[PDB]
Subunit: 315 residues, 4 copies
């Protein structure tokens, strides 16, 4: 039967707080039918798998288990989460190189298993590791996807939502560029129920320019704030990963801000970087090129340039 | 216990295709815990209630029954789908029951009957809500979504004004994932201006086309009513295009007309005044004028 | 990419109140990504498709359209709903024969399209037409499924639920046999949260035997009551069909009372009849054989015997 | 408006792995509209609240914040996960706030601390609920589901008694789609009695195994707490195994212990007394005895 294929299988690589929280999100939302969890720390993955299985009688059924790279053979999705952290005083290039070795030891056995689905990359630095996964795997550009600025965009939406007291699902505003210190807000096309932020501020002049600038700064620094407060961030990114997973596995043609391959968009080439894109069961369909102001376009060029320099030195 | 209040009750007035379909939507999506169905045809409402109850083992539980206006005493929401003298015969007994929630009006002509429900009921402006152009807006979004092959949930565009022949599209603020339609056409010039014109004309005539094909429209509006119901009952502060009372917005006063608004458990919280182009503003003024005259 | 298959497609044959309501249930619950609606009345199917599409912006996306049998080529599921109604004074055998001709004109072009999924049969008489679909299609027994007594079982559960004031999801009780006048309740294994009905009645002696007997009678006659009141029944069966569809398309291994092929169970052979079964993406896995009391087993034998006689005369 | 009440508020006490995970579950499933998180470690609760808020654009909206006991004034539900003197320092200020909803107790030893919360709070018996053997029951169901390759939602089996080493399986009423385990083994004799014994022993030791492997258990109980929370807030009259007050059931009095019960917006509505075999009843008596003595 053609309906022998109606079994969606996800292989998760990295079972830190991000990977674990992602698996839990997929369990609670009933997304996919099978999750294999791969990590060097085997005991932890078994522990997580059996803790997660106990949730199953209150949600939809799944097979969940501690897995190996060879289990990716018939997977739909390989989700790569756990980047080696930057050490005090280590360069960005050194961070990249140590992650490339590790990432090679994940991607090569996954490819060798016969895996032929979509790579979803969340490991930091995400735009760089998305590109690296593309280079290592040999896959088509549109089947290697990074989480990019999807989380920063959610943070930005929720911050605006709180300021104006509106459901963030009615707020539409992007953060773009390389996820990290060089990302920028796209204020020119940001809106609340279709009303641009510029228009909203005209109607509500108590909202000062200084507060909007600070709101974006606070978004850019949000991970640092959360890490300072509780040690690590995870609920945001796990949720954003589950959302991306659903867009793929339910073939949605949803627009999400993701790390996608530049082929001329924004005057950029041959890097992965954060922009809105349409995603479906076959990966990235269209890349949306928001017409940026001169100030926004310069931010995009600066973000990309430093990123491209690091990629060039790295490969 | 304060938790004795965690029981949400809807009274539906009118059990035609629209009302029936709305009840089904509420059942399937697990919205509210109690639905009473009020209509002159008592046998039908009983038939519907018991057919609907049969869906409940595959969803979350509810109390569903054939109801009378007096059952609105402790309802959260009265949804009117059942037409001017008829409305007075519904609203007066609902008010007389002690009902003290939110009126959601879907009966046609909706903007007029929303106003009329406000006048008859004596309720505050923000607690009498009409479905307005929420359905035309969904039609418009889905039509754009099909043209560009994108989830409609990523298309943002409004139809505004009076629901009916004088409604208009707000192209100036319409977008797909934040990229305005004018910007999208520049990037995708196979999309001709004439197709966009036609798209809106097809949205405006869509009820007529559906009626011609199968006799009546109901899945669209049922679904829009359920969505509005969820925004209220889950206190969302969602932005939806609804029939709301004009107190200066767009230069208008003392009518209910379609515009985006924030809605929550207490009804309308903010009315969004989209800055319209001169052409869009004239369309709004003309739609409102003719409506106000009636 | 293997994730080119993550697009679930349902072809609905019959766009009466049952088929239409089913399509609406699938839209609201976000089940499957594509519904093609096939009916002799083409205008009605176009009308329904476009009315349904207007719901899409408040739920998950789908392709919905007026379809033809050839569109079943790559479908997961073909759902057959609209049986020709029994006319006053027409025999049951005549009802069967006129439905067989029509059903042949559906099943042969579906098979000829290359369809290779699962047939879900809801058209009345359902157990007979499930068997007939099996005979006509050539498919394996476990990929031709009828709705059977899933709806009667829901009616029974909800009636008990109302009597005792408990969520019907906590009530577990079956109606079995041929869906229709010969079906019977399985009181011996019926329970509320694990407490059998016999045990519940001991604890709550206000519940009289006469009331339980009447409750089952009222379930058996429920369609007649609904038809007398509003002309037709549809919300019950549409919901039960969507539930079965979800069990298949999400590979649940759920237990549902369905019309399934007897290979010795209950002392029966070579008929489709209603019993609990496990269903998943490949159709019927296990058939559950509830150990019936002598009275319940005799009801099952009588239901099956008359059914088998009609099938024999018909083929 | 009566609809001003359509806003459900939870106060969570204890923001360790269990409490954090529960908040995440409530967020993802769209249960309640407001979560305040109370813990001695204020920086952590703020860190969690803002990490959680970042999930809200992909789900339904909520207010989520670092909270204090005084915020329980108008809560629907107080969920205690944070341990005997500690409990008095939580319950007294919650009661003093004016809180008047339902206590859901998950802290270990749960049956004891549920009783203690009842004693300290002065609340009615049916409005102090413990998670009891809801998690052990889920473990048991999933373990059977895996053995037979059936959705656990179609497996019905209970663990009862005090949550902990004296709990026991109710094999006499356990079933898979209505077919008792004794009946299933007759049809499937590759399933040995020894495997069933082991299965229960593995359920009883499961927390220990999980702790050994990853240090702490949390997804199971979080999920069970969210399910109980939904049963209350959506007024379900669902049957769940919970810690409930014994008033004669199973020959027991004046303790909280695990048994199936009906729960709705007002808390416990009926306690189900499963007719146990002599062996199962003795297990219940022994579990209760030792508990009562403590």
């Amino acid at each position: 039967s053609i309906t022998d294929k109606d079994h969606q299988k996800v292989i998760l690589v990295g079972d830190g707080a991000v990977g674990s929280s992602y698996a839990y999100a997929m369990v609670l939302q009933g997304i996919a039918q099978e999750i294999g969890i791969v990590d060097i720390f085997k005991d932890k993955t078994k522990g997580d798998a059996i803790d997660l299985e106990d949730a199953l009688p209150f949600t939809s059924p799944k097979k969940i288990y501690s897995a190996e790279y060879s289990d990716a053979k018939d997977a739909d999705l390989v989700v790569i989460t756990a980047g080696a952290p930057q050490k005090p005083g280590e360069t960005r290039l050194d961070l990249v190189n140590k992650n490339l070795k590790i990432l090679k030891s994940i991607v090569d056995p996954i490819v060798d298993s016969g895996f032929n689905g979509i790579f979803l990359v969340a490991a930091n630095p995400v735009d760089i590791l998305t590109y690296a996964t593309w280079k290592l795997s040999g896959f088509p550009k549109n089947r290697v996807v990074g989480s990019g600025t999807s989380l920063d965009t959610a943070r930005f939406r929720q911050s605006i939502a709180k300021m104006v007291n509106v459901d963030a699902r009615s707020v539409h505003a992007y953060i773009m560029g390389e996820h990290g210190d060089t990302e920028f807000p796209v204020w020119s096309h940001a809106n609340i129920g279709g009303v641009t932020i510029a228009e909203w501020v005209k109607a509500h002049p108590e909202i000062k320019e200084d507060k909007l600038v600070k709101m974006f700064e606070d978004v850019r620094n949000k991970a640092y704030e959360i890490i300072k407060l509780k040690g690590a961030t995870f609920y945001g990114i796990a949720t954003a990963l589950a959302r991306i997973s659903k867009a793929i596995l339910n073939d949605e043609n949803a627009v999400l801000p993701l790390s996608v391959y530049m082929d001329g968009q924004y005057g950029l080439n041959d890097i992965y970087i954060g922009t809105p894109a349409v995603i479906n069961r076959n990966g990235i369909q269209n890349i949306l090129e928001i017409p940026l102001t001169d100030h926004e376009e310069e931010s995009m060029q600066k973000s990309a340039s430093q990123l491209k320099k690091v990629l060039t030195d790295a490969f």
